[PDB]
Structures are given as structure tokens and as C-alpha cells.
Design a protein around this ligand. Structure first.
Ligand SMILES: CN1CCN(c2ccc(OC(F)(F)F)c(Nc3nccc(-c4cc5c(n4C)CCNC5=O)n3)c2)CC1
Ligand SMILES: CN1CCN(c2ccc(OC(F)(F)F)c(Nc3nccc(-c4cc5c(n4C)CCNC5=O)n3)c2)CC1
Ligand SMILES: [Zn+2]
Ligand SMILES: [Zn+2]
Lengths: 290, 290
């Protein structure tokens, strides 16, 4: 039940409503063209019917509050919002190569160089957020979008929470992150390390080709995480592996900080492409010498 | 996309498909008439599209396994099942007065006598299950259906689990019970007392007119439960109250068993109607003397 055009009565531009893209939570998502400067965006579009409750409403505002304060190369750009009466409309930078999720569906395990390339940009983006006292809290392959030059842009700040003062332990998380950290489940109080944990699972998943804790039942998975029950295939390199081990530790005070991450030998003693062939979208890159 | 008639190719009868009633999980639910003996039932009807995964499938079988083994006056009667290719069809005893939930929406707090009356039948039904090594695991006002003489019948065994051997602690619960017990949340291993806990919340809710741990956010509620944070209004009688206190204790080894429940002075020193006026559906009963 969503209008063909979208008008921003305050910044004044309107948007022709493009094709479906994806959806997540009470949100569905489409591309959309500025219709005058003709420029192209992704528009996240939430029905106010799903938002009848004040608790849902706040969650949604909070996300705009957090996301809108953010500018940086590996974060999905926030270009504004507005609402009618049935809908909230948010304008985002458009990522034309979808998300890491889709790339994974299609390449399963990646080559090491690809892992570094992508992983590095994931960390740079997370270095950004952490330095602004923001925790994403649901870093996963489907929130890591890729623009046209296959650059990573972090997305969906709907579980993103703001750190309000040094030492704060966020005591609850209203939602179900994919790669959820141990300390969240042991309902124990959590902070930035949850993102290091998630990145730990991303790394596994990209190198190993599957999630570090997958099982047919969610609650069993949660069990696994809590007891820290995973294993790293023997073919994964020993340097790669141990960075995983670093981040996938049940005690957050032991996991690397986002900032010392890029230093790890995985990165510094390894080859990191400068860019990627769009081929790499479907064919393992060989990185030959000419 | 559900057939007008329903045929059981093995017990041979077919069912004319009546009016909507309710829904819960992947299930929607209708009344249905035997079409020959013309008798009336509620039919729970699950699309096999929601059941593509083996884990969902098992959950559903388990429920049929548990529920079908059950016969007793305060349990929703199991009258059979069968499937086509798009649907699972289950035939249930029809409860023409909906559930305690609806009665609560309309009367908020109940008179003590009503509470006993209903509560007693809840316990008798639960005494039954517990003696058959079955835990319902999601006793709540909307699973407590009422037939025509306003008798309680327990329903929905889709989180019901079977106890397989003395001492067993069920380690996980794949779902989100309403009135969920502390030990479930502290991911700690649980058994029959979870139902005593739930009944504890039912009692509160029926007497006090609202749930013992309600808050605008679910995760805050869970916090409350874990820390056992509730309070009993001062107008609730002292005998009533303390039965609540008994059942709403964080340590399951302290909560009354289902079997010693009916002994509690709440019941034995109190007036318990033999039946209820259907008036009581919308008007507080006075229980005069003629
Ligand atoms: C799991 N997958 C994640 C990525 N998917 C996707 C498919 C086609 C797309 O446009 C194209 F073709 F140009 F590349 C895009 N591109 C895109 N660009 C900016 C924001 C969002 C977005 C932000 C959000 C969502 N989306 C799709 C959905 C949920 N909430 C969001 O925050 N998506 C993404 C499909 C689903
Ligand atoms: C929260 N409410 C619970 C009770 N509700 C309800 C409304 C109208 C009804 O028929 C009438 F009019 F004759 F009284 C009934 N009667 C009824 N009788 C047997 C089984 C089920 C049932 C079993 C199950 C469900 N139902 C409605 C839904 C979810 N899963 C079940 O196991 N429901 C129930 C409405 C929703
Ligand atoms: Zn499960
Ligand atoms: Zn919440």
C-alpha cells in the first residue's frame, strides 16, 4: 500500500519508487530515483501500522538517530528521512552489488586474499563506529552491502546502540542477531566486543564457507556459542585460524579490539588486493602476475 | 489455499470446513463438521509450506505424538489427524467459549471464587499431564479453552515435551512461552516446575487483572523474571497472595508440585463454586444465597 512517488515536504524533493531489493524486520526496501536530479537511492520503507506501539516506534527513531549521525566510506550513507501517515521513508546510499550474503551463497568459501580485502573494509568500517561509541550489534553477511566497485558498506542499524558513558554495560538487546556474542546470551552485560565476535564469525564463514556454530536448531546453536563449541577445518591456514580463535573467545576482555585488528599478521604478512574483479563475484580470482 | 472439504483417507470421514477461530504459530484454526454424523470440531490446519525443514516437521509430529496420547476432562480432546500434500489436518474437541484469554480481556480481575474454580480445573488438567511425564511448557490464558459449561480444557501442545527418564533436565525449549519460567531463561535445565511457575502467573493474572511481570519490552520482562521482580497488590487476600509467592519462586525445587497444589488453603478454606453462570462471562458473579 505504498505511494508511487515519495515526497519530502521539508527538503522538498520527491522520489520515483523503483524495484524491490530486500527486507528486514518491519522494513521492506526499494530503489528510488530523485526524479529531478534523477539520482538513484535505496529507500527503506516502514509501515506505521507495524509501529503502533511506543516501544517499536522508539526502536525506529533510535536507528535514524544513530544511522543519520554517520558518514564514512564503509558505512551505508544516510541521505535523509520523512514520513506520511502510513509510512516512514528513509533514503540510503544504493549498493548495487547487494550484500556479502549473496556472494557467499554463490562462492561458498573464498580465497584468502578475498577474505582479507573484504574483512579489512569490514574492520575499517567498524573502527569508525567504535570510535563514535556506536555498536552495530548484528554484523552479518547480509548487512554487509557492496557498491559498484565491490566496496563494503555496513548497513541496518536497527540493533545499533549508542554507548552513553565509559564503562557502560548494555544489559539487554531487543532482537535476534545472527552471529550473536556469548555475553549477550548469558544475559550478562555487553559492549563493543560483540562486534569483534561477529566479525570473528564472518571471518570463519568467509574462509570456511559456513558459519562457525550452525545447527538445525537455534537454541542448540546458542548452546554451542555459550560453551564455545566450534572447530576450525585443518586446511585453513594457521595464521588465519588463530585470528579466528582470537575473536571467537567467550570472554570479551580477551578478544582483540577493533583497532588492533588490522595489525594482526593475517593482514600484515598477507597479500591484500587493492581492488577486485567483478568477475570475483562468481569466479574465484587467481591473482596472477600478468 | 485450504480445501473446502477435508478427507481422512484412512478413517474415511470428511469434514465440511467451518468458520475461523484462532491461530498460533504456523497454525490457523477453524471449526468443521463431520458432514455425515454432522458433528462439530475445531480443526488445526498447518500448511506444509511452513514445514519444509526437518526441524519444523519434527516439532509438529512431536505435538501429535504427545497430544494424541492424551485423554482427560480438562485437556482438549485429540480426535485424529491426516494430511494432503499442502496441509496437515488435526481434529480437536471444540471449545465453544473460546479461552481464558478472552474472558480476561473482558473482566480483567476476577472474583476469588472464579479464580479457584478455573484454577482448580487448570491444576487437575496439569496433575494429569505431569503424571504422564508430559510438560505443557506454555500454559497461558490463551491456551486455556472453555467448553460450553465453562469447563477448562488445556490446549496447544506445540511446546509440550515428554520426560523420557527420571531426573531428566530438558536443556532447551525451541519457542517463546508467554509466562516463561526463570530456569528456562538462565538456560539452566528445567522440568515440571515450569508449569507450576506458569500457573503461578495465571493465578496472579486472574486475581490481580494483569500479568505479574509485564513491561513494554520483552527482554526487560525477562530481566524481571530472572531477578524475580514482581509485587502483589495489597488488596489481594493474604492466603491467595502467598500461594502465588509459593509458585513464583526462582528456585523450582521450592515451588509446590502440581499434586500438592489443590491442598493449599487457598482452595481448601475457600468457597469453590460447582459450576458457573454463563453470565459470569461478562458480569461478576455475586454467589448470593438465593
Ligand atoms: C539479504 N540480502 C541483503 C542484500 N540484498 C540486496 C538486493 C538488491 C540490492 O540492490 C541492488 F540490486 F542494486 F544491488 C541491494 N542494495 C541495497 N542498497 C542499499 C541498502 C539496502 C538495504 C538496506 C536494508 C535492506 N536492504 C535491501 C533490507 C533490510 N533492512 C535494511 O537495512 N540494499 C541489497 C538482498 C537481501
Ligand atoms: C487467543 N484466543 C484463543 C481462543 N480463541 C478461540 C476463538 C473461537 C473458538 O471457537 C468457538 F467460537 F467455538 F469458541 C475457539 N475454540 C477452540 N476450540 C478448540 C481448539 C481451539 C484452538 C486450538 C489452537 C488454536 N485454537 C483457536 C489457535 C492456535 N493453536 C491451537 O492449538 N479453539 C477459540 C481465539 C484466540
Ligand atoms: Zn529449534
Ligand atoms: Zn523490546
Amino acid at each position: 500500500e505504498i505511494p508511487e512517488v515519495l515526497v519530502d515536504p521539508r527538503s522538498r524533493r520527491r522520489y520515483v519508487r523503483g524495484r524491490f531489493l530486500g527486507k528486514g524486520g518491519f522494513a521492506k526496501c526499494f530503489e528510488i530515483s530523485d526524479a529531478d536530479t534523477k539520482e538513484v537511492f535505496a529507500g527503506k520503507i516502514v509501515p506505521k501500522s507495524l509501529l503502533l506501539k511506543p516501544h517499536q516506534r522508539e526502536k525506529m527513531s533510535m536507528e535514524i538517530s544513530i544511522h543519520r549521525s554517520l558518514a564514512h566510506q564503509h558505512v551505508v550513507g544516510f541521505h535523509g528521512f520523512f514520513e506520511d501517515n502510513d509510512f516512514v521513508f528513509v533514503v540510503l546510499e544504493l549498493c548495487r552489488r547487494r550484500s556479502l550474503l549473496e556472494l557467499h551463497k554463490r562462492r561458498k568459501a573464498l580465497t584468502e586474499p578475498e577474505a582479507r580485502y573484504y574483512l579489512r573494509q569490514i574492520v575499517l568500517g567498524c573502527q569508525y563506529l567504535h570510535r563514535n561509541r556506536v555498536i552495530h550489534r548484528d554484523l552479518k553477511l547480509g548487512n554487509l552491502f557492496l557498491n559498484e566497485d565491490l566496496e563494503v558498506k555496513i548497513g541496518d542499524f536497527g540493533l545499533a546502540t549508542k554507548v552513553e558513558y565509559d564503562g557502560e554495560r548494555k544489559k539487554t538487546l531487543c532482537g535476534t542477531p545472527n552471529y550473536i556474542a556469548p555475553e549477550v546470551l548469558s544475559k550478562k552485560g555487553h559492549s563493543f566486543e560483540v562486534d569483534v565476535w561477529s566479525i570473528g564469525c564472518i571471518m570463519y564463514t568467509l574462509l570456511v564457507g559456513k558459519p562457525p556454530f550452525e545447527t538445525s536448531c537455534l537454541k542448540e546453536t546458542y548452546l554451542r556459542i555459550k560453551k564455545n563449541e566450534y572447530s576450525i577445518p585443518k586446511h585453513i591456514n594457521p595464521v588465519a585460524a588463530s585470528l579466528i580463535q582470537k575473536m571467537l573467545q567467550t570472554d570479551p576482555t580477551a578478544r582483540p579490539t577493533i583497532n588492533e585488528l588490522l595489525n594482526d599478521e593475517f593482514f600484515t604478512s598477507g597479500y591484500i588486493p587493492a581492488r577486485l574483479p567483478i568477475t570475483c563475484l562468481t569466479i574465484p580470482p587467481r591473482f596472477s602476475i600478468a
